[PDB]
Amino acid sequence: ADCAKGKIEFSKYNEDDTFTVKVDGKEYWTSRWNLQPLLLSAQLTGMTVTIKSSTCESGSGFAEVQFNND
Amino acid sequence: ADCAKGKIEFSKYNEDDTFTVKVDGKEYWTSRWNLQPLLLSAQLTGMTVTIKSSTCESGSGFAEVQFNND
Amino acid sequence: ADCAKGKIEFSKYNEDDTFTVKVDGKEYWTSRWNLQPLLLSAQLTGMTVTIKSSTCESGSGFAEVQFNND
Amino acid sequence: ADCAKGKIEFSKYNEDDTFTVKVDGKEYWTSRWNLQPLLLSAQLTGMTVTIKSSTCESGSGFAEVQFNND
Amino acid sequence: ADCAKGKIEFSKYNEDDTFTVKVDGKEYWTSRWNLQPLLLSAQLTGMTVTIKSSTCESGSGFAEVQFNND
Ligand SMILES: O=C[C@H](O)[C@@H](O)[C@H](O)CO
């Protein structure tokens, strides 16, 4: 389901090789290695991201995310 | 066969590590890793892509795509 | 041997995970995975590339290229 | 620990295959190859970065970094 | 030592997977495949780069490089 739709206000490369983004005032992270360069490209180029997940509370893991232009 | 032609409406990183793009009203996906950064960049810059595949209805897989600045 | 000098008219991710470019009306492929985001960038920014190989016919494999800002 | 917040002043690919960045007048290195294209991306677009690590002297190793677009 | 300081005039993916750049009249090559996308980016954007090496004569190899903005 759709956890968070907005820009990335920040992203963070973590010690455990995971990647966090803050979207709509909610941090989420992912262990999808290959997602990384993609998220940072979204951030850098002001894309709207939709973070899609089973569990949507601030701090959970994710592996699905849509990229929209806007 | 030329399935779709146009800009990427949106893209989506999928839970099974496949990558989906929407072109001329239809959704297609790839499981070629190397394809993701490539599709993203294309969307970012408004490239015109031609998805080429075996079947062309929405939901189809593809491993072939032409990039134009068209 | 300089097979084709110019700008990339279009680029293609092949079914067989190789990469095709078209330059001064002739098409070339590389199996060099490394070269993809590179070729893609040169197209995006309209660089002059010089493709190089021992055999200069259309749909020949190549493994060397010069990226210029010409 | 927030070791340094600012813009990346320069970056350097090291002989030993680590990667250094200068932020708020201090040098930090990382061995996470994955950070390299992100950090160069952040520099070119003058994002503000926060280097995070256990220890903060100049010439320390780090693997945690926040990317602000702000 | 510092071999050359300036913008990249051209770059070249060699057959052997090495990557050659030309800076201030002098060619150098690296076999660090991670350097490739970083060096193409610096060329596209016109960063000043510093090739650091044990031997500075044109045509020699390097495994260290610094990027600066503008
Ligand atoms: O062999 C490594 C795997 O390919 C892994 O990197 C996945 O891509 C994680 O998303």
Structure obtained using? X-ray
Contacting subunits of A (3+ beta carbon pairs below 8 A) = B, D
Q: CA angle, corner C16, sides to C38 and E37, nearest 5?
A: 15
Helix (H, G, I), strand (E, B) or coil at E40: helix
C58 C-beta neighbours (distance < 10 Å), count:
11
Secondary structure of D1-66 in HEC code, one letter for each residue: CEEEEEEEEEEEECCCCCEEEEECCEEEEECCHHHHHHHHHHHHCCCEEEEECCCCCCCEECCEEE
- D7, D25 contact by CB (below 8 A): no
D60-61 and D26-30 strand pairing: parallel
The rounded distance, in Å, linking the Cα atoms of E64 and E39 is 12
Output phi, psi for D63, to 5 deg. Answer: -145, 0
Contact A67 B12 (CB under 8 A): yes
Query: Contact, D29 vs E55, CB < 8 A?
Result: no
Distance of CA A58 to the CA centre of its chain: 12
Residues 6+ apart with CB under 8 A from C58: C26, C27, C28
Among left, alpha and beta (phi > 0; psi -120 to 50; other), residue A44 is alpha
According to DSSP, residue C11 is labeled E
Sort E2 into a burial class: Cβ within 10 Å, 0-12 / 13-18 / 19+.
Answer: exposed
- What residue's CA is closest to ligand 1, atom 6? A33
Residues B64, B55 contacting (CB under 8 angstroms): no
Beta-bridge partner residues of D52: D2, D64
CA angle in degrees (0–180, nearest 5) for A35-C28-C8: 70
Q: Scanning every residue of chain A, which has its alpha carbon at the shortest distance from the alpha carbon of B34? A: A34
CB distance A63 to ligand 1 below 6 Å:
no
Distance from CA of B28 to the nearest CA of C (A): 15
C-alpha span between B42 and B32 (Å, rounded) = 16
Question: If you measure CA to CA, which chain A residue comes closest to D63?
Answer: A15
- Decide whether any atom of ligand 1 lies within 6 Å of the A13 Cβ: no
* Closest by CA position to A9, among listed A18, A19, A22, A20: A22
Amino acid letter, residue B65: V
Degrees to nearest 5, angle at CA A45 with A8 and B34: 95
Residue B17 alpha carbon, nearest atom of ligand 1: 10
Ligand 1 neighbourhood includes A69 CB (under 6 angstroms)? no
**Helix, strand, or coil here: C7?**
coil
D17 CB-near residues (< 8 Å, 6+ apart): D31, D33, E32, E34, E63
CA angle C27, C29, C31 (to 5 degrees): 175
Residue by residue, DSSP assigns A4-55 as: EEE-EEEEEE-TTS-EEEEETTEEEEE--GGGHHHHHHHHHTT-EEEEE-S-
A17 lines ligand 1 (CB under 6 A): no
CA distance linking residue C21 with residue E10, whole number of Å: 19
- The stretches of chain C forming alpha helices (DSSP H) are 35-44
C-alpha torsion sign, points B7, B13, B16, B17: positive
- Chain D residue numbers with beta carbons less than 8 Å from the beta carbon of E63 are 13, 15, 17
Residue spans per domain, chain C: 1-70
CATH of domain E1-70: 2.40.50.70
- Residue E14 carries which DSSP code? -
In this structure, which residue's CA is closest to atom 10 in ligand 1?
A32
> What is the CA E19 to chain-centroid distance, rounded?
8
- Contacting chains of B (3 CB pairs or more, <8 Å) are A, C
CB D56 within 8 A of CB D4: yes
CA distance A70 to chain B (A): 10
Contact (CB, 8 A) for B35 and B23: no
Residue D18 in tokens: 């680590």
Please report which helix (H) or strand (E) contains residue B44, including its range.
Answer: helix B35-44
Q: Give B-chain residues touching A69 at CB under 8 angstroms.
A: 10, 43
Q: Are E60 and E28 in contact (CB under 8 A)?
A: yes
Ligand 1 pocket test, candidate residues A16, A18, A34, most atoms within 8 A of CB: A34
For residue E25, the distance in angstroms to the closest alpha carbon of chain D comes to: 21
User: Which position has the token pair 């201030």?
Assistant: E24
Nearest CA-CA distance, residue D15 and chain A, Å: 23
What's the N-to-C CA distance of chain C in angstroms?
19
Please answer whether residues E53 and E44 qualify as being in contact, where contact means their C-beta atoms are separated by less than 8 angstroms.
no
C-alpha to C-alpha distance for E20 and E9, rounded to whole angstroms: 11
